[PDB]
A paper describes a structure:
Sixteen ovarian tumor ([name]) family deubiquitinases (DUBs) exist in humans, and most members regulate cell-signaling cascades. Biochemical analysis and five crystal structures of [name] DUBs with or without Ub substrates reveal four mechanisms of linkage specificity. Mechanistic and structural studies of three closely related, unstudied OTUs with distinct cleavage profiles revealed four mechanisms for achieving linkage specificity, namely (1) the use of additional Ub-binding domains (UBDs), (2) specific recognition of a ubiquitinated sequence, (3) the use of a conserved S1’ Ub-binding site on the [name] domain itself, and (4) the use of an S2 site enabling DUBs to bind longer chains in a linkage-specific manner. We selected three members of the OTUD family for additional investigation: the unstudied Lys63-specific OTUD1, the cdc48/p97 interactor OTUD2 that cleaves atypical linkages (Lys11, Lys27, Lys29, and Lys33), and [name], another unstudied DUB with activity against Lys6- and Lys11-linked diUb.
To understand the specificity of OTUD domains at the molecular level, we determined high-resolution crystal structures of OTUD1 (aa 287–437, 2.1 Å), OTUD2 (aa 132–314, 1.5 Å), and [name] (aa 52–209, 1.55 Å). The catalytic domains are structurally similar to each other and to OTUD5 (Huang et al., 2012) and S. cerevisiae Otu1 (yOtu1) (Messick et al., 2008), root-mean-square deviations (rmsds) being from 0.6–1.0 Å. Catalytic triads are in competent conformations, as observed for pOTUD5 in complex with a Ub suicide probe (Huang et al., 2012). UBDs do not always influence linkage specificity, at least for diUb substrates, as shown for [name], where the removal of the UBA domain did not change its ability to cleave Lys6- and Lys11-linked diUb. Importantly, the amino acid sequence in the loops varies significantly between OTUD family members, in particular in the His and V loops, indicating changes that may account for the observed differences in linkage specificity. Substitution of the His loop of [name] by the corresponding sequence in OTUD1 (mutating R178YGE to LSNG) rendered the protein significantly less active in comparison to the wild-type (WT) enzyme and affected its ability to target Lys11-linked, but not Lys6-linked, diUb, even at very high concentrations. Altogether, the structural and mutagenesis data revealed distinct S1’ Ub-binding sites on OTUD family enzymes that contribute to their ability to target selected Ub linkages. An additional enzyme worth studying is [name], given that it is, so far, the only DUB that cleaves Lys6-linked diUb with some degree of specificity.
Residue numbers in the entry:
A (entry chain A), B (entry chain A): 50 to 190
The structure:
């Protein structure tokens, strides 16, 4: 259908704008931290707490791991600062914090990862982009 | 990917909500009227003005018509109250009013019909749904 010409335009139509985080493997936790706390300075803590939750809830998270890769290897790699995180990390963070994460993408359907079974919870917004990069999505005014 | 369970939830995540218009063929002009003016009472006028614009700009709109259907037949049918309108009517209305129309759809990419070549213009929001039905999309707070 009739597409937006830029991601900035798409967000702007929704009264939203990007808050970019650096192009390294810590981007998801920086973006989620920015959403949760208004800044990304606790990204190492969020990475560690997210891995801790995944381990505590191993039976829930082993299904996410790409086959023939041991769960231990997956979470050990994720524990290292700079390791790019994926959807399973978003699920873990969302469940740990009992909230939802809405994911924006240029000319793609808006996604929602729900951390609870509840009906009215806190909702965080991030943007998925090239490679494995995530940014924070904030209100304009 | 991870989809919203309802259209209401999807809009709510964006701070938006549906304002339903009746399930008849006047829905697009009622929805556009609601967006433009805050109410749908001028839907007959918007239909007539939209057809007038399409006729004035025939060379621009003939390409939209499904082949072997005469342009005259298309616009004559569209002029009748109750005739369901399509994308070409949105383009015509947007160009006539020199604005943009953003179209929401459940678990589909957000669309944008741009009425001008400009960079900063007024933006109207509607929702496309089952059949040929459109509703108005408004801010929650």
């Amino acid at each position: 259908g009739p597409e937006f010409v830029s991601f900035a335009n798409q967000l702007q139509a929704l009264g939203l704008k990007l808050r970019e985080v650096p192009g390294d493997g810590n981007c998801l936790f920086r973006a989620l931290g920015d959403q949760l706390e208004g800044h990304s300075r606790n990204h190492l803590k969020h990475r560690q707490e997210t891995v801790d939750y995944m381990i505590k809830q191993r039976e829930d998270f082993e299904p996410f791991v790409e086959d023939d890769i041991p769960f231990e290897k997956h979470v050990a790699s994720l524990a290292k600062p700079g390791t790019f995180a994926g959807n399973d990390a978003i699920v873990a963070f969302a469940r740990n914090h009992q909230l939802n994460v809405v994911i924006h993408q240029l000319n793609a359907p808006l996604w929602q990862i729900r951390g609870t079974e509840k009906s009215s919870v806190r909702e965080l917004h991030i943007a998925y982009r090239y490679g494995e990069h995530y940014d924070s999505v904030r209100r304009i005014n």
